Design an enzyme around this catalytic site. Structure first.
Site, PDB file in Angstrom:
ATOM      1  CD  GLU A  39      31.287 -34.372 -57.133  1.00 41.79           C
ATOM      2  OE1 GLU A  39      30.506 -35.231 -57.059  1.00 41.79           O
ATOM      3  OE2 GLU A  39      32.056 -34.433 -58.116  1.00 41.79           O
ATOM      4  CB  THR A  68      23.221 -37.539 -57.856  1.00 41.80           C
ATOM      5  OG1 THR A  68      24.083 -38.316 -57.153  1.00 41.80           O
ATOM      6  CG2 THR A  68      22.081 -38.844 -58.063  1.00 41.80           C
ATOM      7  CE  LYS A 128      28.963 -40.241 -60.449  1.00 40.74           C
ATOM      8  NZ  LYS A 128      28.381 -39.266 -59.546  1.00 40.74           N
TER       9      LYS A 128
END
Length: 202
Positions: A39, A68, A128
């Site tokens: 990621e 993010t 998450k």
């Protein structure tokens, strides 16, 4: 797709990293270590450009996503940059709607049950658990009861000592990104190789 891909690969790496060049040179070290899920957190400068330039790892077998991703514009840049799944630290209804309409796998961040239930009602059962360092494996173990159909991806606070401890509670894949990204690309790969094998065995 992304769901069983996660359940198979059993780890995802978030790149807490510096400039595009170092981000690119560090997303190869983890790949050679066996961490095929990667990621590119937008905290790096121009993560869209990083993903666009690094899409060549898709053929080799890397799975590149965006981490993010706080805003819908960032979600745009991530999708048009070639990322195949968007990750956010919180729950964002509009980002989750865009991901649903564009068919981009999205696992928002939920820390508490009143956020988890909202996530479920939006249709995401893979979540998450941010921050793992604060909640612990206890959150997953205790929440396995009331919501047994929700499976977690604890990002933050996962390291060598307790990664399969988080795995002995019912998670898919830890989201480690600072105990497997902090170093030089000759030891980042070494940590990735010694970290994707303890996950496999423990």
């Amino acid at each position: 797709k992304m769901e069983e891909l996660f359940k198979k690969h059993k780890i995802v790496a978030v790149l807490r990293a510096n400039s595009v060049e170092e981000a690119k040179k560090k997303a190869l070290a983890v790949f050679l270590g066996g961490v095929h899920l990667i990621e590119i957190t937008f905290t790096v400068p121009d993560a869209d450009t990083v993903i666009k330039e690094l899409s060549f790892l898709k053929e080799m077998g890397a799975i590149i996503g965006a981490g993010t991703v706080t805003s819908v514009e960032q979600a745009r840049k991530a999708v048009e940059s070639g990322a195949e799944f968007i990750v956010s630290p919180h729950l964002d209804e509009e980002i989750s709607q865009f991901a649903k309409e564009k068919g981009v796998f999205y696992m928002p961040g939920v820390m508490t049950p009143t956020e988890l239930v909202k996530a479920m009602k939006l249709g995401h059962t893979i979540l998450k658990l941010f921050p793992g360092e604060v909640v612990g494996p206890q959150f997953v173990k205790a929440m396995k009861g009331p919501f047994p159909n929700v499976k977690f991806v604890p990002t933050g606070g996962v390291n060598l000592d307790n990664v399969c401890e988080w795995f002995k509670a019912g998670v898919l894949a830890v989201g480690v990104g600072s105990a497997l990204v902090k170093g030089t690309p000759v030891e980042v790969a070494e940590k990735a190789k010694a970290f994707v094998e303890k996950i496999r065995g423990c």
